[model samples]
Target: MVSAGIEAMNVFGGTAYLDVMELAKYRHLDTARFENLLMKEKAVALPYEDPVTFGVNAAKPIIDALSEAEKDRIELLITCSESGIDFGKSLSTYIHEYLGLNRNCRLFEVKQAAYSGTAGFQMAVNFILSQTSPGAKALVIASDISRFSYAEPSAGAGAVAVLVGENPEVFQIDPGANGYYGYEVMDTCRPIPDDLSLMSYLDCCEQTFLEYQKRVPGANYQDTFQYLAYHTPFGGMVKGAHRTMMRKVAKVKTSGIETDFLTRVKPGLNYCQRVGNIMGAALFLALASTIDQGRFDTPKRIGCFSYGSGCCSEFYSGITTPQGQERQRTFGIEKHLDRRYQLSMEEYELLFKGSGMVRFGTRNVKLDFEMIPGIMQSTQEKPRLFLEEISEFHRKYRWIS
Candidate 1:
């Protein structure tokens, strides 16, 4: 029984769209096999469950893999997703009560755009580090449906769940570190005349980078991590941001900064350039891809940067150890996103438009239209809760093993 609770992860989303597959032929990402992979990975088991469904599906492997006793020991639950429909009720209340995690445990929800995942992670880390005795634990899940206005360069979706605990062997909670900064700017956004969506989205992407560069000078922190992870709405936005940072530092004469940029961050940038954005799961997906790309061996370091409107940004680090290979080995995720069925720009338009309209009970969605994976619902009633089913997304989750 490995009771050193720390962090566990799961994902839900299909890889290729019909149009993406058709276009990938141009990029040579095995277009012919793209749809095949998407079909194989049909994220249907938990497909339409909603954002909370994402976390619930993510929790299945975790529940099954844990000893009946460990499951019983669980105490707190946190659900993070921009797509979470009902804000007041909080998905945690649903999850904690639904899983029968224990009456004594607590539940809550966190949202800060895509950065909610990291926000949840940081909170869980802090909670675990502070507690004693049977030692308390927490669950932080990031699930989202990324849609921007009518049609844009980047609009996508994905979900991920990370069960965070203490001194866990699954993924060691290496000493944690981060940097924070923010400012106002206008670049891109989705909002009404008075809505702050535009200011929020724009600042999240554009200003966050500026803050990173400014911090790089003072903190002298190097890009030693395997990848620099962020909330991605489109693959291009991710690459664009990284390119901006790389080019910015390239012009700088700072030796420490240049060395960190070349050897560390490049591996991640190379991989993200291949996979499009995955909203809440952007950073996690990039980590999986970079690992699969073999840019580094087991136990590599990767940097993570999180941003959300109202403008809060933070940089953190995570290291991959030999034990992480267990989770990595089962991370056969490329096949799903890689095998798209090809939706023309028009088809993509229709698909993106239909996002979020359908609710839990009555979603008239195609098998492939949704994340394709099943979604989860919490036992906590009253407010209503939905989680994306990660098991539906993964052919089989092995991290629990």
Candidate 2:
């Protein structure tokens, strides 16, 4: 049978991060009411680091690892995000040029909140499975940064790049196994009403999985997969969703659900806790965390549920082998996470105030490289991409090492 899924995957969790607990305390948010948030630290984007830089940095490692012949085979590049720079030009165009991909390629972008990443992933998988252009590969990059002042607790910035092709080394898709559930309601951007949005999200989780069960014969919620990677806005949110699925789908007692959750789901959330909710990149980031943290002595299936408000959801499954796990761990995502310069609460407040330096549709302005002294310096010895200037509405990028 033909194979189609991720060939290589890597996460660029940004160059700087802030401790979320400190943020909550600093902002005078009642930590008691915020107890279930379960956030640790969140990556904070610098003024010079926009969606384009995040996308390029996330994909560059994967791109550099491939042989010239292999990299040249990347026929499609899709940039998926809720955080976009331009309304007219596709983010894929900028990502493609910076990555130096061959000219004979399709460049496009996908935007549907956090679900954008999965949409691009499924599209790339179908393209590979179709065999219309056999041996061709596609790059799907989910890069997002939440700039809004509200939701700061969960708002995060990062990028996840998945290189998809016929070789299903990282994650092998279970073709035809998909369940979708979605409907529109004014959730986010709707103030006090949005506070009740958790009910809508919880509903989406059950419906999507139930819909998957009808399509996938004998798809046992608890046993079909060894791990679960849900689109986590916060670690506690995932814990809630897992419990709901266990109760509704698996019919597990409360006692069993907690143990099952610890065994089957917690590993996937390791990174999400550290990186917070990266919107479109959340699910893949969770998946990447699972690949790194979960034990896969033998091949195992991972059930992934992705939900995006405004709002769409999907349930899907994929398998990863021990060899696949080993290959993925080579990227050292955890090591990269540790290298990020931790931001002081004061420094964080400064960055938050300076976010307006590069607001949407800025005409032209040069970015300050030394906005946070020693930040760029700390990221040295590694090739990184950064935004240099917005030259007449055009984003100019520079390569730094």
Candidate 3:
């Protein structure tokens, strides 16, 4: 831990999922072979949601959990996503109104592949540290709906929200203790609006971890940190990343560290295995999953590795507080994940096509925040938000009680 800096509170995750087995059967690929190839069991498949809705759903719980005073304290709202609804408008504005937040806050969005979420996080930390006003808070969210070609079956969709505030509750970020490396590579790209890479991606992963080792002197494969989390495009590829890091750690002059990298790093994959690749939100979702396991009974330092395609990578760490574990237990994330409806191959295909269809004409596209499962407790009178219509070149939002 960096001792004193911005702290995370009320981290929340949301998704609606598709089973990979069903998808494999749809493509007439062997289920066993497909799972072996991608190292993922299922991917998040949205039937009626997009980045905008998913982003709002992800933040609902955090906002609802706070008191009026706490909510008013939020001075900044930032959204990170590769999937955007409009090119000119900031998605954060829609989110700000949907969440019914105070109007006196700065709002914006960040896009930098999967790494944007972490970048937004770092920025939130800086903002909170620089704030002269008391009780200042920042709500940062990363949401995406990845629609890769049939070849990329591991692509998943979801969102994760982090509430950054004072006095620390969930996890305290360590500033100045970080490493990063950037290079121009086409390992992953969206050149023609319908494209996406991995041999070069793997190379970037290896080199970035090596750069991390150079920054943190005496860093090794084990014991330096209690838990390790990595940006997972897919669950299986993470194993390969850990193996590469372990080989490099072996070259470093360190002893008494765990040489068995597989055993040493399996904890971080628990959530990734379940949720697939949530793109920008992958690493934090994995961090939440690792903390939920409670394998370590005390507060521990967590190692985080975030990588984005086109390509940038960062390595950083944060300390998990005891309250964080209690919050996770109360959050019941697994129950929400269990409630997702599994899609058959045909249903999955229809949903995928429906997601791509552009809505035309002036009609009401409801943004019903209350109907989303696992977001909040239900009431007889539920608050609602709406994307009223897209008429001419204008998109409008409406809220109703």
* Clash count of each predicted structure: 48, 0, 0
lDDT of 3 by residue, 2-34 (tens): 133334432323334566666666678765655
Which digits, one per residue and each the tens of the lDDT, describe model 1 over residues 1-401? Answer: 22333445655553233344444443456534344322111121123345555565556556556676777656767777666545366766655555557676767888765567777777777777666535566777666654332222233445566667764534454443555555554433334311364445444545544454564544333334455555544444454455555555434444454454455544444333333444555666555554455443456655566766555666665565556656644644454345334445454445444443444333233433244221112122222224322332322111110
> Model 2, stretches more than 4 Å misplaced?
189-196
Q: Weakest 10 consecutive residues, lDDT, candidate 2?
A: 188-197
TM-scores for all candidates? 0.65, 0.97, 0.83
Model number with the top TM-score: 2
For the record, the alpha-carbon RMSD of candidate 1 to the native fold, in angstroms, is 9.0
lDDT of model 3 at position 241 = 66
lDDT of 1: 0.50
Model 1 spans with C-alpha error above 4 angstroms: 1-6, 14-18, 21-47, 96-100, 132-134, 146-153, 168-176, 183-223, 250-276, 295-298, 335-401
Candidates, ranked, lDDT? 2, 3, 1
What is each predicted model's overall lDDT from 0 to 1?
0.50, 0.87, 0.66
Superior by lDDT: candidate 2 or candidate 3: 2
